[PDB]
Structure 1
Amino acid sequence: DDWRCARSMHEFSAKDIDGHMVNLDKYRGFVCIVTNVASQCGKTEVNYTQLVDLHARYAECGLRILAFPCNQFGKQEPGSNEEIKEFAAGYNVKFDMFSKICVNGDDAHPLWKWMKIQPKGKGILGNAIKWNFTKFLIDKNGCVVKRYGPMEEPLVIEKDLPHYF
Structure 2
Amino acid sequence: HVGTDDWRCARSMHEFSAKDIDGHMVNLDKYRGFVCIVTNVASQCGKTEVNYTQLVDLHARYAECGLRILAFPCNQFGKQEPGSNEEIKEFFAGYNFKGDLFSKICVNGDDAHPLWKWMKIQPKGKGILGNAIKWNFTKFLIDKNGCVVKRYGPMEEPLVIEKDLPHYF
Common fold: TM-score over 0.5 = yes
Equivalent in 22, 31, 36 of residue 26 of structure 2: 22
- Alignment partners' CA distance in 1, 2:105 and 2:77: 12
Residue 164 of structure 2 aligns to a residue whose secondary structure is helix
User: What displacement does 1:2 show?
Assistant: 1.1
Residue 160 of structure 1 aligns to a residue whose secondary structure is coil
Post-superposition CA distance 1:67-105 (Å, at most 9, x none): 000000000000000000000000000000000000000
Post-superposition CA distance 1:93-133 (Å, at most 9, x none): 00000000000000000000000000000112110000000
Identical aligned residues as a percent: 98
- Alignment partners' CA distance in 1, 2:168 and 2:23: 31
Matches within 5 A, 1:75-114: 75-114=79-118
- Alignment partners' CA distance in 1, 2:128 and 2:38: 19
User: What displacement does 1:55 show?
Assistant: 0.1
- Alignment partners' CA distance in 1, 2:150 and 2:58: 16
User: What displacement does 1:4 show?
Assistant: 1.1
Residue 59 of structure 2 aligns to a residue whose secondary structure is helix
Find the counterpart in structure 2 of residue 49 from structure 1: 53
Residue 59 of structure 1 aligns to a residue whose secondary structure is helix
What TM-score, normalized by structure 2, do the two folds share?
0.97
Aligned length: 165
Q: CA RMSD in A?
A: 0.5
- Alignment partners' CA distance in 1, 2:81 and 2:9: 30
User: What displacement does 1:16 show?
Assistant: 0.1
- Alignment partners' CA distance in 1, 2:164 and 2:9: 27
Moved over 3 A (4+): none
User: What displacement does 1:135 show?
Assistant: 0.2
- Alignment partners' CA distance in 2, 1:157 and 1:124: 18
User: What displacement does 1:9 show?
Assistant: 0.1
Post-superposition CA distance 1:17-76 (Å, at most 9, x none): 000000000000000000000000000000000000000000110100000000000000
- Alignment partners' CA distance in 2, 1:125 and 1:73: 17
What TM-score, normalized by structure 1, do the two folds share?
0.99
User: What displacement does 1:5 show?
Assistant: 1.4
